[model samples]
Target: MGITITDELLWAILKDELSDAEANALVWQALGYVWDEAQSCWKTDLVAPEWRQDYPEPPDFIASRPATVKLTRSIPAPYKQLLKEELGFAGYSINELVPRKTRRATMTNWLLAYRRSQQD
Candidate 1:
């Protein structure tokens, strides 16, 4: 057969390009597992936690996780002004609140690192 994307091949590729936490997150996504940040763990969908051991390490620190929330698409001028004025938040927080589709514009790696670090 031609090249096929198997779990082992996928794992190898993903692990090569990602950290343990990132790889694990992708595994969770593939398995339809959801993250309950409040619980600091992934929620089981069709698979059990025990079966996911080979995936990778679950995320530990929550300081730099991806933005989970999103801003309203039809944001009004007042809210836009408010959002701009309230730009004191960190990149992840701002990204989370901003519209999911538009998050990449401001949450680039350069900006994220700057926002995460001390603003001096």
Candidate 2:
């Protein structure tokens, strides 16, 4: 069975290895790096948030979580260290606590998502 990866797992793993904010930022960087199955190397796909959902890439928040899982699985010792440094490994943002769809970036990638306007 394919393992279902999640942010919490990534958080715990990093927390065990590094500080909180560092783990958080590593979570962010993991999201920045996407799996390139063919090339077999992690490729940075940091695009404008607007471009996120257009190609079936999940909105940044959720997308990042699973990527964190993949990174944890793929890399060995070196990556673990990099991830800790990258994630910030601190606290979860209140905004990040909620579902991405509820946020304005829902797919728009608008930094300041006026969800009340379009989504209402």
Candidate 3:
């Protein structure tokens, strides 16, 4: 790593007591920030000034891991509205038209099982 961790960045990390996966998710989300949507992805100014000050140059070993979580819904409204409201999802919109009860139930069960596993 090339950049030294700043007090602000370190404070932000320590302030939240998250599981390993959750912590990584937060950090990765921060790393992907763009000050302006119109700017190039590679060149946009990072939102965290402290993070930038600490990491003036790119790190020698930057790492990223992929992650996904399952979400369950009880009704048509849930499959579209409930999950979005509870999770506070802004950019992610549900588009898939779940036209049947059986499919909706199955998808809900699958996500419920996955969500339960996160606790253990």
Measured over all alpha carbons after superposition, the RMSD of each candidate to the real structure, in angstroms, is 16.6, 15.9, 16.5
Per-residue lDDT, model 3, residue 33, is: 41
Best by TM-score: 1
TM-score of 3: 0.20
Please count the clashing residue pairs in each candidate, in the order shown.
1, 16, 0
Please rank every candidate by lDDT, starting with the best.
2, 1, 3
Which has the better lDDT: candidate 1, or candidate 3? 1
Error of 2 at 57 (Å): 20
Against the hidden reference, what TM-scores do the models get? 0.25, 0.21, 0.20
Model 3 off-target regions past 4 Å?
1-99
16-104 per-residue lDDT for model 1 (tens digits) = 44444554454345434567678687655544544355444433222433331211222333343322233332233443443432323
For candidate 2, what is the lDDT?
0.36
Model 2 lDDT tens row, 1-120: 112234354444423443334334443343454556687854455633433433354324333443333323434453333223433443335655544323212211111111112232
lDDT (Cα, tens digit) per residue for candidate 3, span 20-41: 4444433334444422436534
Q: Assess each prediction's global lDDT (C-alpha) against the native.
A: 0.36, 0.36, 0.32
